Every structure is written in structure tokens, then in C-alpha cells.
Design a protein around this nucleic acid. Sequence first.
DNA 1: CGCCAGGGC
DNA 2: GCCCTGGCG
Lengths: 293, 295
Amino acid sequence: RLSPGEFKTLISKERKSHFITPFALVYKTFCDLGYDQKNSDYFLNNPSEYIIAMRKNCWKEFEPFEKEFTTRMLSYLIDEERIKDMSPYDAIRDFTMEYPTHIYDLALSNTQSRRSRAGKEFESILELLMMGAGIPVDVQGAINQIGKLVDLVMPGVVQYTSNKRNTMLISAKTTLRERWQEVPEEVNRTGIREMYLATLDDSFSEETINILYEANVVVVTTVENKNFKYKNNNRVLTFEDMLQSAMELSRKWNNVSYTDSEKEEIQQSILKQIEKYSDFPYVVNYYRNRLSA
Amino acid sequence: RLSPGEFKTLISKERKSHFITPFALVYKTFCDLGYDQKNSDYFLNNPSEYIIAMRKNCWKEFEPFEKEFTTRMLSYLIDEERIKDMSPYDAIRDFTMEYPTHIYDLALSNTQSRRSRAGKEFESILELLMMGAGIPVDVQGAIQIGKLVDLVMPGVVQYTSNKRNTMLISAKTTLRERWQEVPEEVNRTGIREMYLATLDDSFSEETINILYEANVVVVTTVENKNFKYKNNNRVLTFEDMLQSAMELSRKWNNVSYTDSEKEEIQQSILKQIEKYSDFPYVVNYYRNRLSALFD
DNA sequence: CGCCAGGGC
DNA sequence: GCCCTGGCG
């Protein structure tokens, strides 16, 4: 047998051993699609195309594996001795009567995985976009003044702490629902000047756009989605717009002299990130460039 | 042979047909447990107990029914002609292999319903608590003010005129990071203070303190306060909240309204009686308030 | 401690 | 258009 509690604990063991991390999957997909071979202008000019292709292919490289995983987990429930000499129809009926909780719990675990993974994959996709564009960023998940809702800080947290002038903060939510309300909260709490909110959401309202606007949160989506749903609306930006802004601001940072301590802190920031991303050559390379400059 | 989209359509049709609404279930449970006969002092004094008993009993009814529903939905995909000559073991194995999107879509639909229902039911339980306590409230789902405010004491008309001596209540069964929505709404509309009712046992001192600076006060059961937040004068119990509501409500007891405000209030109440037309206890609560405008 | 490949109400 | 009987990462 296997109690629902015991099944839940098992579900977790297997998921870990069977699935590579969201960042690992994104990185694999980045390299498989040959994005590690494109120059910086590709990322600057085609971020929507890149995001859409990444999303497409990450899902392709996940979905068949989630399907197999589910079937494996359910196999632990099948009880040969209980069902032996049952009619095949009665065996399935029994299974749908005896285990609809275990079954529900497996699927619940899967959706919860999917939600967390979708967000982390989306953030990873955007992170590699900035790295491919050659734009200096600290990844908050790789190292108050900055809430955890902010994923990317350009050009880094040390510089931002020094002065928020000429910096860019980016948050991401795949869909918004009412969860966009979290963002103005973080903006107001820490005195953030403005924040970019990257999304794939095709359904948010003019009311939402305006409330975010008043709060100095700028919604950024793919050019496809803007043109299809928000074409006229100058308060909705595209990734193309955001990348051009990021690039412009970044240039203000490519010839700066730092104090002993500041340079020390920045080095320590980048060091932390080389450590986190040790196993990913393209990313370690990105940071190394920043460190020797 | 049901396609995944067809199965989704059936699941939605069947769910609508067979499950009563969150409020209807709460109202049934309220009456089944005898709360519809308790005086206001009962609710004033025993809110935490009432809330937990309501939650337990709502779930006791719902969960067996949902289990039976799930089994019934799944039986629409059993294919006799397909499975005729397989062993029972191979039959199940095949089932686990042929319908993964179907089974997942059903469970997904179930948890999404559970999430939506859990919030609506908690809100309904708190609504009936205030009604039982005899405290005047407008229910935002029944008639500026953020859409996450559930109850407005004594009413939206009065609140709009002047928020002095009013009370606003929001509710979230669990907080996660979603508590961040509350300061956003407080700050957007200039809310003086908001009570945030929750059953969550796990929120941090940092969250408490950020909410505190935002003039949002977390309200939870006695049990949760004493187990996890015993020392902490920033975390209130439902008992504390009800005492505050009752004290503020007395300021609204014999208020003389202009004819204009009186007719707007009347409109707001009459609107809510419409929403709750099917629920005698709630209609009677509102008609007492309507009657008070002519007293 | 944040995410929401998120449908339900 | 807000809910999260919500676990995963």
C-alpha cells in the first residue's frame, strides 16, 4: 500500500531525481536553440521573438517528461493482489474509487510545480536575455532597498545602493490576475523610482494599466501581445522598448571609476554570482567579463 | 471517447449542476449548526470558535461530495470496448497512460474551484458573523473602496461620506506573499486602517511589521494567536476585532440622516436583500436595518 | 518566501 | 476581476 501522506513524500523524492532545475532547463534550451551563438544586437532587437521561442521550447522539453512522471507515480498505487481476478472494467472503477485523493494529490503537486517553474523559467529566460544583450545585471536570486519581487537590477545592487539614478529594476509575472497589486506595494515600500513589470498576460485592463502607471510600474510585454490587445496604448511597452532603455542606461555605466570599497563590493557581488552559476559556462563567462573590466 | 476539451466542458457543466454555491453551503451549515438562533452576544464573545466550527463543518460536507464527483467524472473516460481483453493490472496501467491530460485537467479544475470556494466561504463565514453580531455591514459582493475589502461597517454610503468611525475588513485564508495586495489597496484609496482576517499560522514578524507600517492589522483565531503570536500586540484575535466593531457600531445607533443619505442607504440595503433573496436569515438582518431608517 | 503553463466563482 | 482547502522551487 501507500498512504496519501506517504505518496506525497514519495512524489517529492522522484520529482527531484527526474527533473532538472528551471534554470538548468532554460539554459539547456538557450544552448539547444543556439542562442549562445547570437551577438548582442540579436537580443537587443528581437527580445520578443526570443522570449516566445524560449517559452515554446522549454514547454516542449518539459511536457513529455511531466507526462511520463505522472504515469510512474500512479504505478505505485496499482495493487496487483487487490485487483487480481477483477474484471478489467471493475479494476479501473475500483482504482477511480479507491484512489481519487492520491490521484488528485499527484496532479495538485504537478500544477504547483508548473506554477513555480513557469515563474522561475520566465525569470531565467529574461536573465539570459540581458546576459545575451551584454547588459550588466545582478540577479537577486543569485546573491530593505530592493524587494524579492525584483528579479534583475541593472547594473547591480552595489551601484543601486550607492544611488538609484540611472538604474533599472525589472520584475516578471507570467500572468497578472490581481497579483500585480504586489508590485506597487514593493515600489512604495522601498522608494523605488520606477519598476518594469514584464508579463505574457493578454487580458489585463485599462484600469490595471492606469493604477500601475500612477504607481510608476511600467508593464512590458511581447510586441505580438501589445499590437494585438494594446496597440494604441502608450502606457504598455514592448520588450523591444525595454531592451532599448536598458541598453541606453547601461552605456552610462561602461566607463565609470569606482572607489576601493565600491569596486570591492561589486567584485564580491559578481563573485557570489559566478559561484551560483558555476556549472553554466556561458553565464560564468558573462560575469568574468564584468569582473575583469 | 472524450477529448480533453470536451471533458473540461462536461466537468464545468456537472460542477455547476451539482454543487451548491459557497455562500449557500455556508448558509446551510450556519443553520444546520443552530447559529441562526444565537444572540448577538454569542458572536461577539465566541467568534474564533464559530469560525473554526463553520470551516470544519463546511469541509465535512464538501469533501465527500467532491470525492464522489471526481470518481463520477473519471468514469466518463472508462472505455469498455478498449479494455475488454486486458488483465485488470494492464487495464489500470492503460488508464494511467491514455488519459493523463484528462485526469490532470479534472484535478486542476478541482483545486481551482477549491481555491475560489475557500476564499468565498471564509468571506461568507465572516459576513454571517457580523450579521449574527447585529453589526451593520455592507457586503461588497452584494451591492473608492478596494475590491479586496469584503465588509464595510456601517455601510458604503456612510463610508463614502466620511470614513471616520468606520471599519473595513479584508480576508485571506492564507497569506503567502499575497498580503502585499492589502497595503497596495490601502495606499491607493487612503484607507485609514484595514483589518486583515486570516487563518494562516505561518506569517513572519517582518510581514507583521510591514503591514503595521501600512496600517493593516492581522486578525486570526485565538488558537493561532496564542500558539504562534502570543506576545505580539500587533496581531489581534477575532475577539478583539468584534469588540472594536461593536464599539464603533454603537456610534451609528441613533444617527439622523438627511433624506438624501437615508434614501441612498435604503437603496444599498434593498440591493443587498435582492442578492440574498433566498436566505431568510440574511433578509431579516437587512430588513432590521431598513426598519431602523424609519425608527 | 515568491510563483501562478490559472480555472473557478 | 479577485480567490488561493497552496505545494513547489
